[PDB]
Design a protein around this ligand. Structure first.
Ligand SMILES: CCCCCCCCCCCCCCCCCC(=O)OC[C@H](CO[C@@H]1O[C@H](CO[C@H]2O[C@H](CO)[C@H](O)[C@H](O)[C@H]2O)[C@H](O)[C@H](O)[C@H]1O)OC(=O)CCCCCCCCCCCCCCCCC
Ligand code: CLA
Ligand code: CLA
Ligand code: CLA
Ligand SMILES: CCCCCCCCCCCCCCCCCC(=O)OC[C@H](CO[C@@H]1O[C@H](CO)[C@H](O)[C@H](O)[C@H]1O)OC(=O)CCCCCCCCCCCCCCCCC
Ligand SMILES: CCCCCCCCCCCCCCCCCC(=O)OC[C@H](CO[C@@H]1O[C@H](CO)[C@H](O)[C@H](O)[C@H]1O)OC(=O)CCCCCCCCCCCCCCCCC
Ligand SMILES: CCCCCCCCCCCCCCCC(=O)OC[C@H](COP(=O)(O)OC[C@@H](O)CO)OC(=O)CCCCCCCCCCCCCCC
Ligand SMILES: CCCCCCCCCCCCCCCC(=O)OC[C@H](COP(=O)(O)OC[C@@H](O)CO)OC(=O)CCCCCCCCCCCCCCC
Ligand SMILES: CC1=C(/C=C/C(C)=C/C=C/C(C)=C/C=C/C=C(C)/C=C/C=C(C)/C=C/C2=C(C)CCCC2(C)C)C(C)(C)CCC1
Ligand SMILES: CC1=C(/C=C/C(C)=C/C=C/C(C)=C/C=C/C=C(C)/C=C/C=C(C)/C=C/C2=C(C)CCCC2(C)C)C(C)(C)CCC1
Ligand SMILES: CCCCCCCCCCCCO[C@@H]1O[C@H](CO)[C@@H](O[C@H]2O[C@H](CO)[C@@H](O)[C@H](O)[C@H]2O)[C@H](O)[C@H]1O
Ligand SMILES: CCCCCCCS[C@@H]1O[C@H](CO)[C@@H](O)[C@H](O)[C@H]1O
Ligand SMILES: CCCCCCCS[C@@H]1O[C@H](CO)[C@@H](O)[C@H](O)[C@H]1O
Ligand code: OEX
Ligand SMILES: [Ca+2]
Ligand SMILES: [Ca+2]
Ligand SMILES: [Cl-]
Ligand SMILES: [Cl-]
Ligand SMILES: [Fe+2]
Ligand SMILES: [Mg+2]
Lengths: 505, 37, 30, 36, 33, 172, 34, 342, 63, 34, 81, 38
């Protein structure tokens, strides 16, 4: 019989049951989406978008609903923190319900197409054999794809007839769903410009409509029909898989580096924002502007939004997790409660000292404090017997500005050292580690998990492309090579051109 | 209903059963430590 | 429960060896 | 055509390889890279 | 030890689901002809 | 040690104390097992590529071979005709006995040298040491990748068996 | 740069010397092709 | 009829000493430039401005320590094209900035594509199935995951492998100390596939060579084989009985045997590639949380797992200042982790 | 095979299996579009990579 | 009667010509002193 | 069997060695002079043994800015003289 | 405006076109000169 890894080849010459199997696959994926949204709604805590946003809670499909304008619950809350909102039907719950109902309808359609597989539509009128005109099907589907692509950009994303898309300021503080106009200049190819997403779908959609019409009306050249085996549905599988691993690598890349379609309020900040101290520089800029306007030090730091300080913390860096450290980020360092405020370290001479921050590469990192010029002034020693820079020897103190600890100063070495250890992580927060029995070990965000899955799947689909491309172009030898293979085809110099009998020398 | 002419019997011989069970069991012996963590 | 799991999987593998050797599909010259 | 015997070509070529590799090992002990 | 509490059923289904798939296929091969 | 993580412990300490990565017998060992895996995949792929058609599209091609049949089950002339054109004709084996001798000898000899690497580093004849080999005109040390290896080895050395050494040199 | 000509002249004289010896057989090979 | 395309197709597929093909238009320039780039860099080009390292024969390195080193971390993931905004067409500066690294990595990638296309093209011309090209997907998965995806997930090309013997050894030790890569089950499967592949290579070659039929009078038995002969040159039946009685199981199907020889090393390399994709994101198998919770509370609890972490901590602290010069690490003596005396 | 109302409506859309245009047909035009597409992907890649830097195009969150 | 210049000839010299040049360069390096 | 002249014929012929007794030593000497004249240093920008550091400096000249990296190296080089 | 890196982009584009054009021009020329005999 068929070996286990070929059972699905019974569909190759049976278009009705292929459509049935595709309907069943579509039913399963739609049902997964509905089930996933329901599970997330059953676990998502909407009470603090500042320090407990969705990306701290392991939310994977919630940000995708929010990205395209679904932001509210039937129960009255919204992900931006508003109360008494009425989202109409298209709440997170309505989206989930719609996917479940779609799933069921697709399941029933699959049953019909499986039983009524023998439709005259699937027979070539000349031969009576099962046949799909794949070149014309491609034009039909490309035209439909173009119409949908165009409509998505021209109506949904613009807000002309639809809600728009998630947009935010450069520091992810004030995000919301907004209508977005297309950008028709060169900045439309800037990945961080949302207007470019709008213009892409308008323009690529129109091109898809035109190319779809071309592919409906113009038959393939004989040379290409033969070369790509366009009568063989496995050629479409091969090239479709290739397109799909290309797309998977692109979405993995734009998730990891960030773009207008992977906003940090939905997926968490990027690792490169920690690498470049992106948020620390903005925090310092605002504090300096406050001081220059005559604010005190406590006032300047108290003016920093907790949300901004929270981005400047390595526990939100997606490059700090582990492959088998499962679950939400809150399961690791805990549920963030409050900013403790900015810690300023000083030695006995009153010089300000700065804790060397942890790079993402290091699971652990020493505690070293320098002056503004990078000269080492204090540390936590390993060997003590020749220590010169201990906090005890250097009289290191820590004072807090802003946050919970605003106005307080600590001088006992154990406490000062404890805050110095947290300062290698950036800004310091109070966490609830009890509610979830958090274990204190960093986990990655949905940005990390998405990137991982899609880079891995993209790589595996490269193999699938290679495999089915091979099966397409070598179909005639799939069961083995010619038993009467003339040794002269593989002997050198017999034919002038390799494998061409008409070039016998 | 008229029967479908595309149906095929499926087979798994005993050696393939043994090879498959070895793969599954060894993969489980390998990954279980990480599932328990 | 972890130790039981590890030893169980190992025991299944050893049983599999026994069947794969003494209850194999016999090789036959055709 | 074939006036120079192949075994002489191989012997001379092989001796040339030994000389050049030998020179490279000499340089590991002298000048740059010698640690001295 | 504080192990992951889902590790037991993860390991159990990891073994059982593909193993029973293979057993189903094997036995119905033996019963043919 | 007789265990998975204990094996890694042995390897890391071995690198710290013998610089095994820089030892040519371990390098031959790597050539042996990388090469063995390469030639395994090569030979497997070449024989599989030239199986003679004996089966239909809906059965495993493995049923085209019967245990104990006298005829070869693949066309070695076709396989050589492929591989000789992949590289060039004289880089390919046309003699099955020569081919299979090579498949035996390459990993076996390479792993012999691996074993002899461990067995001679057992007597502290260690990998190449190029620590501070490159020096500028004044005498400043110009680091190479060997010096970076040395820093990693030092980290292993100073931390391993952290309570066992009382005197400054680890002499066994 | 004098050093460029100092380095390239050995190769230049080599190519020149090789062409001189192979020229009659080169034009004979090319004459057969056309 | 025979247009210029078909006339060109004719010439490309001539049976000559080195086959060219359509794939050769991609393969030969890219393979030649990658190899020539490596030989050029290891012979003449420094890593002083990117790493603070000497890396060429010209500076005094030997075959084991030369490399074409990655660009400086400040380049990020710049393509670093010769005509790009960093080198601005200046060949000397391009070399000093690490341009040869992306030159080799990128021409190498397209050369590997060209080689796999060659495997398809030749198989199609001689009439064999394309399993050699299929098996080559494993080398490609390794090259792409290690030399492209991994640095693309990290801060810059700086942390990709540098092209050199000792440079690669450094890469191994970095992965131990920072990623605990030996603990990763995708690496472990890779190891099993490589060592299992080497085992299969050795045992199959030795089995064939020791179940040969006597097909000649010579005591050296290689001449007693004819490529065109129909008969198996060794006894599968005797080989099967030997291994059945020695090891308990034995191959009986030669087609399965040789497919298995493809499957094992190819699958192993594919698994190792998946683990490296995870390490691109620092998604490591670094720890066992249950072990760490127990060890933190119980200072008498010790396993080989906790012992290896101490080694990793030493590797990181002792190698990072020189291995990551852009970070400007200064670790005072007193903070360095060290056991007693050493 | 079974005829249906919808099947009869759609029949012309699945009736030209195997139909080809002679020879090379529109292959030259296709090649041009492929080349333009390749240049397009190269442009957007190099913009994202900061290898191609254009006035008014700040490839940053600060866009 | 054999041709002299072939594809093989080109492939041989793209490798052999730089190799000998490089080997002369590395030979000279052995006499460099800091 | 592929039409080209066998290598063993070529490298045992007198004409081959008449040509290559010149071309092989000429290339070797050209490579030698590429190093001995110092041209290799200037083509590839490799430091001579006296050009890694200025007389009193001990910090490596690491490139730290992507888009002005060319000028940074030029500044590093000026500080040697 | 046309920035220096856009000028660089054009230079790289033209360089690749030249390399490819010359390559195919030479290959087509040789293929027409040395045809296979049938
Ligand atoms: C199967 C294989 C088959 C055959 C393979 C053939 C191989 C062909 C060769 C392809 C070469 C691809 C080069 C990609 C270079 C790149 O990515 O370059 C990276 C750039 C992004 O630039 C980076 O961006 C980072 C983030 O910056 C951003 O954030 C910063 C901090 O806040 C600042 O705000 C800054 O202004 C802002 O731009 C840092 O700046 C880095 O230094 C910088 O290098 O993306 C880009 O060019 C484009 C990114 C989107 C497309 C990515 C698709 C290709 C890669 C898929 C793999 C993803 C890997 C994910 C990890 C797993
Ligand atoms: C693209 C796929 C994808 C991604 C990126 C996410 C991402 C996320 N999920 Mg979701 N999920 C998904 C699909 C996905 N999910 C699917 C399909 C289901 C149904 C099962 C779920 C059901 C689900 C639940 C119930 C939960 C999540 C949660 C989460 C969050 C934590 C993830 C985690 O800990 O993983 C850990 C990842 C691993 C341990 C990796 C496993 C690697 C496998 C085992 C390797 C197998 C190797 C193979 C056997 C080798 C064979 C080789 C052979 C060929 C030789 C994270 C945001 C959690 C959350 O926080 O919710 C709020 C949570 O509770 N997800
Ligand atoms: C659009 C995607 C797609 C589709 C429609 C197909 C379709 C097919 N494949 Mg291809 N393939 C693909 C992608 C795809 N493949 C990818 C990504 C790879 C690399 C992993 C392959 C590698 C591949 C090989 C090596 C082979 C096929 C074969 C086949 C044919 C028979 C499949 C069968 O009976 O399996 C039966 C499968 C089972 C009974 C169980 C499989 C269980 C898997 C391993 C674990 C669980 C998977 C899990 C449910 C996946 C969830 C979804 C995922 C995206 C996360 C069928 C035409 C076979 C063929 O060519 O036959 C002639 C064949 O030998 N495929
Ligand atoms: C098949 C052969 C091949 C391939 C695939 C590559 C590929 C590559 N080369 Mg390599 N190279 C090759 C052969 C090849 N090369 C040869 C023979 C030489 C010796 C001359 C070189 C010398 C070389 C150098 C010195 C460098 C590269 C570089 C590169 C990389 C960037 C190339 C690029 O951006 O071009 C873009 C150009 C194209 C893609 C051509 C597209 C042509 C279109 C389709 C036609 C339109 C042309 C248009 C009309 C012209 C208008 C111009 C006008 C508007 C001003 C890329 C990996 C760079 C690198 O590696 O960076 C680290 C680099 O610095 N190559
Ligand atoms: C029949 C149906 C099939 C049944 C199969 C049963 C599953 C058996 C195998 C389980 C594998 C996963 C075990 C993880 C351990 C665990 O407990 O997770 C548990 C986690 C959930 O995590 C939990 O979350 C909780 C709060 O919700 C708590 O915080 C818990 O502490 C935390 O463990 O489950 C998941 O996250 C599932 C989603 C994982 C997404 C992975 C994406 C990337 C995968 C790509 C892999 C490609 C590999 C290709 C190789 C070829
Ligand atoms: C004629 C046709 C030839 C065609 C060749 C085609 C190109 C491919 C060539 C690959 C060669 C790669 C090795 C070059 C080594 C070198 O030059 O070292 C050159 C170095 C030069 O020696 C160094 O010179 C410096 C000068 O300042 C210093 O003096 C150093 O102290 C000194 O060590 O020599 C050595 O290191 C001695 C050992 C070299 C032997 C290496 C063998 C390794 C083989 C591994 C397998 C690789 C596959 C190659 C197969 C061919
Ligand atoms: C070291 C010895 C290497 C040869 C043994 C290889 C491992 C055996 C594998 C398992 C048995 C595999 C097996 O059964 O082999 C069988 C194979 C053929 O056997 P025959 O019976 O035809 O010939 C061997 C004797 O009977 C003499 O005719 O043996 C040989 O070819 C020996 C070749 C020795 C040639 C000279 C000896 C030394 C050569 C060194 C090889 C390279 C060394 C350089 C490396 C740096
Ligand atoms: C066919 C049976 C062969 C039996 C021996 C088998 C031994 C195992 C093979 C391992 C040894 C490998 C070396 C063979 C050694 C060998 O067997 O020698 C025999 C071989 C034949 O020399 P002849 O003088 O007989 O030449 C006759 C032919 O040229 C006439 O068509 O000599 C060479 O091939 C020299 C190689 C120079 C090749 C330089 C070309 C450079 C082109 C670069 C492109 C390469 C491919 C690119 C694709 C990526
Ligand atoms: C019938 C009907 C109905 C109903 C419906 C329903 C109720 C549905 C549901 C559905 C559902 C409820 C579905 C679900 C699905 C799911 C899925 C499909 C999943 C899957 C999963 C997976 C595939 C996974 C995998 C994995 C694992 C497990 C681990 C990790 C890794 C991975 C990720 C791979 C209604 C009423 C409408 C009416 C009409 C008719
Ligand atoms: C990069 C680049 C390029 C290219 C260039 C080239 C292409 C080059 C080539 C080059 C070459 C092509 C070179 C070569 C060299 C070679 C050598 C250097 C060799 C050596 C050898 C030896 C030393 C040997 C050894 C040995 C062995 C291996 C084994 C046995 C024995 C003995 C030990 C002897 C261009 C311009 C495009 C552009 C710019 C960039
Ligand atoms: C929790 C994990 C669950 C995993 C579940 C996996 C389910 C796997 C289902 C396998 C279905 C096998 O499908 C079964 O195929 C066999 C042949 O192989 C068919 O059998 C058919 O062919 C055989 C062999 O010629 C004939 O003897 C038989 O009379 C005929 O009906 C059955 O009609 C069908 O029921
Ligand atoms: C005075 C020493 C103890 C208080 C200061 C120590 C750092 S702060 C401390 O750190 C813990 C880990 O992050 C958190 O769980 C907790 O919420 C936080 O208060
Ligand atoms: C770059 C190769 C792919 C594009 C091939 C397009 C061929 S185009 C094709 O070519 C024939 C000659 O070959 C001509 O006779 C014919 O008129 C022309 O239409
Ligand atoms: O035991 Mn295991 O390790 Ca051979 O070195 Mn000495 O001793 Mn201990 O130190 Mn390092
Ligand atoms: Ca607890
Ligand atoms: Ca001197
Ligand atoms: Cl230890
Ligand atoms: Cl001691
Ligand atoms: Fe074999
Ligand atoms: Mg020297």
């Amino acid at each position: 019989g068929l070996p286990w890894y070929r059972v699905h080849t019974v569909l190759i010459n049976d278009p009705g049951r292929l459509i049935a199997a595709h309907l069943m696959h579509t039913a399963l994926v739609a049902g997964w989406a509905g089930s996933m949204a329901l599970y997330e709604l059953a676990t998502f805590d909407p009470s603090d978008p500042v320090l407990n946003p969705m990306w701290r809670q392991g939310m994977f499909v919630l940000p995708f609903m929010a990205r395209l304008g679904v932001t509210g619950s039937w129960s009255g809350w919204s992900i931006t923190g508003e109360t008494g909102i009425d989202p109409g039907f298209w709440s997170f719950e309505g989206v989930a319900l719609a996917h479940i109902v779609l799933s069921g309808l697709l399941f029933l359609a699959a049953c019909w197409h499986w039983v009524y597989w023998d439709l005259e539509l699937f027979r070539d009128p000349r031969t009576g054999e099962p046949a799909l005109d794949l070149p014309k099907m491609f034009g039909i589907h490309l035209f439909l794809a173009g119409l949908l692509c165009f409509g998505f950009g021209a109506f949904h994303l613009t807000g002309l007839f639809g809600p728009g898309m998630w947009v935010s300021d450069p520091y992810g503080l004030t995000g919301s769903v907004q209508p977005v106009a297309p950008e028709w200049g060169p900045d439309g190819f800037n990945p961080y410009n949302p207007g470019g997403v709008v213009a892409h779908h308008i323009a690529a959609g129109i091109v898809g409509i035109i190319a779809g019409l071309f592919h409906i009306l113009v038959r393939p050249p004989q040379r290409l029909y033969k070369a790509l085996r366009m009568g063989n549905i496995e050629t479409v599988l091969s090239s479709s898989i290739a397109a799909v691993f290309f797309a998977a690598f692109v979405v993995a890349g734009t998730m990891w580096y960030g773009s207008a379609t992977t906003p940090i309020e939905l997926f968490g900040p990027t690792r490169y924002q920690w690498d470049s101290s992106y948020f620390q520089q903005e925090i310092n800029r605002r504090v300096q502007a406050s001081l220059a306007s005559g604010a005190t030090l406590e006032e300047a730091w108290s003016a920093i939004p907790e949300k901004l300080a929270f981005y400047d913390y390595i526990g939100n860096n997606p490059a700090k997790g582990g492959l088998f450290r499962t679950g939400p980020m809150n399961k690791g360092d805990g549920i963030a409660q409050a900013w403790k405020g900015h810690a300023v370290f000083r030695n006995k001479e009153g010089e300000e000292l700065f804790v060397r921050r942890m790079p993402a590469f290091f699971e652990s990192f020493p505690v070293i404090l320098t002056d503004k010029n990078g000269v080492v002034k204090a540390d936590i020693p390993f060997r003590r017997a020749e220590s010169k820079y201990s906090f005890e020897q250097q009289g290191v103190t820590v004072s807090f500005y802003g946050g919970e600890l605003n106005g307080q100063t600590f001088t006992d070495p154990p406490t000062v050292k404890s805050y110095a250890r947290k300062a290698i992580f950036g800004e310091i927060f109070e966490f609830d580690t009890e509610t979830l029995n958090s274990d204190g070990i960093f986990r990655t965000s949905p940005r990390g998990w998405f990137t991982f899955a899609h880079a891995v799947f993209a790589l595996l689909f490269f193999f699938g492309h290679i495999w089915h491309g091979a099966r397409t172009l070598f179909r005639d030898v799939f069961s083995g090579i010619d038993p009467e293979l003339s040794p002269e085809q593989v002997e050198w110099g017999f034919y002038q051109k390799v494998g061409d009998v008409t070039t016998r020398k | 209903m008229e029967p479908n002419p595309n149906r095929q019997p499926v087979e798994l011989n005993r050696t393939s059963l043994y090879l498959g069970l070895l793969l599954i069991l060894v993969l489980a012996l390998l990954f279980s430590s990480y599932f328990f963590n | 429960m972890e130790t039981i799991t590890y030893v169980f999987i190992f025991a299944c593998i050893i049983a599999l060896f026994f069947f794969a050797i003494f209850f194999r599909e016999p090789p036959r010259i055709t | 055509g074939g006036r120079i015997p192949l075994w002489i070509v191989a012997t001379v070529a092989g001796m040339g390889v030994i000389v050049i590799v030998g020179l490279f090992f000499y340089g590991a002990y002298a000048g740059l890279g010698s640690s001295l | 030890m504080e192990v992951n509490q889902l590790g037991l059923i993860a390991t159990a289904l990891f073994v059982l689901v593909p193993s029973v798939f293979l057993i189903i296929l094997y036995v119905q091969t033996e019963s043919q002809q | 040690p007789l265990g998975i993580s204990g094996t890694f412990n042995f390897m890391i300490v071995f690198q710290a104390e013998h610089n095994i990565l820089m030892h040519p017998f371990h390098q031959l060992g790597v050539a042996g097992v990388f090469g063995g895996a390469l030639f395994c995949a090569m030979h497997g792929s070449l024989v599989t590529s030239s199986l003679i058609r004996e089966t239909t599209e809906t059965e495993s091609a493995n049923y085209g071979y019967k245990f104990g049949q006298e005829e070869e089950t693949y066309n070695i002339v076709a396989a050589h005709g492929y591989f000789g054109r992949l590289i060039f004709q004289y880089a390919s084996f046309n003699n099955s006995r020569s081919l299979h001798f090579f498949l035996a000898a390459w990993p076996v000899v390479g792993v012999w040298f691996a074993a002899l690497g461990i067995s001679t580093m057992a007597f502290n004849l260690n990998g190449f040491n190029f620590n501070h080999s490159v020096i500028d005109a004044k005498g400043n040390v110009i680091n190479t990748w060997a010096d970076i290896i040395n820093r990693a080895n030092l980290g292993m050395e100073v931390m391993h068996e952290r309570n066992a050494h009382n005197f400054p040199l680890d002499l066994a | 740069d004098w050093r460029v000509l100092v380095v390239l002249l050995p190769v230049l004289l080599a190519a020149g010397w090789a062409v001189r010896n192979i020229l009659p057989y080169a034009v004979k090979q090319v004459q057969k092709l056309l | 009829e025979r247009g210029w395309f078909d006339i060109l197709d004719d010439w490309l597929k001539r049976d000559r000493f080195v086959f060219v093909g359509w794939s050769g238009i991609l393969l030969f320039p890219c393979a030649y430039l990658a190899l020539g780039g490596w030989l050029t860099g290891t012979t003449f080009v420094t890593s002083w401005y990117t790493h603070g390292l000497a890396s060429s024969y010209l500076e005094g390195c030997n075959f084991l320590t030369v490399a074409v080193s990655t660009p400086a971390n400040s380049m990020g993931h710049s393509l670093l094209l010769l005509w790009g905004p960093e080198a601005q067409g200046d060949f000397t500066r391009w070399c000093q900035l690490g341009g040869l690294w992306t030159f080799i990595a990128l021409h190498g990638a397209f050369g590997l594509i060209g080689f796999m296309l060659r495997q398809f093209e030749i198989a199609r011309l001689v009439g064999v199935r394309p399993y050699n090209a299929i098996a080559f997907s494993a080398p490609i998965a390794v090259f792409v995951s290690v030399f492209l995806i991994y640095p693309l997930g990290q801060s810059s090309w700086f942390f990709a492998p540098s092209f050199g013997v000792a440079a690669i050894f450094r890469f191994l030790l970095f992965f131990q100390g920072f990623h605990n890569w030996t603990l990763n089950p995708f690496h472990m499967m890779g190891v099993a596939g490589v060592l299992g592949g080497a085992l299969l290579c050795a045992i199959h070659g030795a089995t064939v060579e020791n179940t040969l039929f006597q097909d000649g009078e010579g005591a050296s038995t290689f001449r007693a084989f004819n490529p065109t002969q129909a008969e198996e040159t060794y006894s599968m039946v005797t080989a099967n009985r030997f291994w059945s009685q020695i090891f308990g199981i034995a191959f009986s199907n030669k087609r399965w045997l040789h497919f298995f020889m493809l499957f094992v090393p190819v699958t192993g390399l594919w698994m190792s590639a998946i683990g490296v994709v995870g390490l691109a994101l620092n998604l490591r198998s670094y720890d066992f949380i249950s072990q760490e919770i127990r060890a933190a509370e119980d200072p008498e609890f010790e396993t080989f797992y906790t012992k290896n972490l101490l080694l990793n901590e030493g590797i990181r602290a002792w190698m990072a200042p020189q291995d990551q010069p852009h970070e400007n690490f200064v670790f005072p003596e007193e903070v360095l982790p060290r056991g007693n005396a050493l | 095979a079974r005829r249906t109302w919808l099947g009869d409506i759609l029949r012309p859309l699945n009736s030209e299996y195997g139909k080809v245009a002679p020879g090379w047909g529109t292959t030259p035009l296709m090649a041009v579009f492929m080349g333009l597409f390749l240049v397009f992907l190269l442009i957007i890649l190099e913009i994202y990579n900061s290898t191609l830097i254009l006035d008014g195009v700040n490839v940053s969150w600060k866009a | 009667s054999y041709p002299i210049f072939t594809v093989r000839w080109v492939a041989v010299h793209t490798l052999a010509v730089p190799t000998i040049f490089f080997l002369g360069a590395i030979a000279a390096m052995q006499f460099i002193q800091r | 069997t592929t039409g080209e002249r066998p290598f063993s014929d070529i490298i045992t012929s007198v004409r081959y060695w008449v040509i290559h007794s010149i071309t092989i030593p000429a290339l070797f000497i050209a490579g030698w002079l590429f190093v001995s004249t110092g041209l290799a240093y200037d083509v590839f920008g490799t430091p001579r043994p006296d050009s890694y550091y200025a007389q009193e400096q001990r910090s490596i000249p690491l490139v730290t800015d992507r888009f002005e990296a060319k000028q940074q190296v030029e500044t590093f080089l000026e500080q040697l003289k | 405006t046309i920035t220096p890196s856009l000028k660089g982009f054009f230079i790289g584009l033209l360089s690749g076109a030249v390399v490819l054009g010359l390559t195919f021009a030479v290959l087509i020329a040789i293929s027409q000169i040395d045809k296979v005999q049938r």
